[PDB]
Amino acid sequence: LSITTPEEMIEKAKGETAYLPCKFTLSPEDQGPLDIEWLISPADNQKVDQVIILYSGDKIYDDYYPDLKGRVHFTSNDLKSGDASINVTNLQLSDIGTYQCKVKKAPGVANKKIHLVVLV
Amino acid sequence: FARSLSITTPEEMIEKAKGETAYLPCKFTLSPEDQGPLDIEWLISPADNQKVDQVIILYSGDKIYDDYYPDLKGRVHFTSNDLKSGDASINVTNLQLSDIGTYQCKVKKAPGVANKKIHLVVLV
């Protein structure tokens, strides 16, 4: 299982929307249920690997997770097509940090990091 | 029911001698909103290398993938015959010194997620 988006740094201004890409391709043995998660490790605290969004069992859980609640959502209307990307709206300085996309389609697994910086 | 998906004793150390079998416990309790498909994964971060978070076993879509993952292939398996009952424990047979490291049990039953860490020590 591969995430074809490279690790990169996204820099946007406060108040704008950040698109954090995560596109993936599957290998032949990846026959299990698709599961996608993003995690944040914020620059403003010592917390790491906090879940911000999850697709599992063909359902999306977004605002359920408190970090970035109301502001992080999947961008695609068809995640199964290979697009696990997210948008973070109304960017705040507290959103700065490392975001990790995790894609699983059993037994395959892949992960990729995107760095986000927000400018005043 | 717990308030949120929980694992009993989320951080501990297990010690066993070389050649023996280690039992790594991971017993979980669901909360009422945990209604998605059960998914369980274990990872290893070996003391003897820079690699971290390497998958060693997975239960997903009601199937177990164990030897599929190269780390500890042939030697790591789930111990229970009923994972859905709350038992995500694994065992590692014929322990080698190279097995020393941090093992993470991750349990998901969407939207709930919980993790446990076990430091495994193998004695000569």
Pull the structure tokens for residue A29: 């043995």
**Within 13 A of A34's CA, how many CA atoms are on the CB side?**
17
Strand order in the sheet with A97-105: A8-13, A108-119, A97-105, A34-42, A50-56, A59-61
**Within 13 A of B41's CA, how many CA atoms are on the CB side?**
22
Chain A residues whose CB is inside 8 A of the B68 CB are 107
Q: Where are the beta strands (DSSP E) in B1-124?
A: 6-7, 11-17, 22-24, 28-29, 38-46, 54-60, 63-65, 76-78, 90-92, 101-109, 112-123
Query: Exposed, middle or buried by CB within 10 Å (0-12, 13-18, 19+), for A112?
Result: buried
In this structure, are residues A32 and B40 in contact, taking their beta carbons and an 8 Å threshold?
no
In this structure, are residues B102 and B119 in contact, taking their beta carbons and an 8 Å threshold?
yes
CB within 8 A of A102, min separation 6: which ones?
A36, A37, A38, A39, A109, A110, A111
Q: Which residues does B contribute to its contact with A (CB < 8 Å)?
A: 35-37, 39, 55, 58, 60-61, 63, 65, 68-69, 108, 110-111, 113
Q: Which residue has the tokens 């500890």?
A: B72
Domain that holds residue A120: 1-120
CB contact under 8 A, B60 and A33: yes
Q: Considering its fold, how many domains does chain A have in total?
A: 1
Residue B124 distance to chain A (closest CA, Å)? 34
From A112, A113, A117, A120, select the one nearest A3 (Cα to Cα).
Answer: A112
| Resolution (Å) of this entry | 1.4
- CATH code for position B53: 2.60.40.10
From A44, A15, A35, select the one nearest A103 (Cα to Cα).
Answer: A35
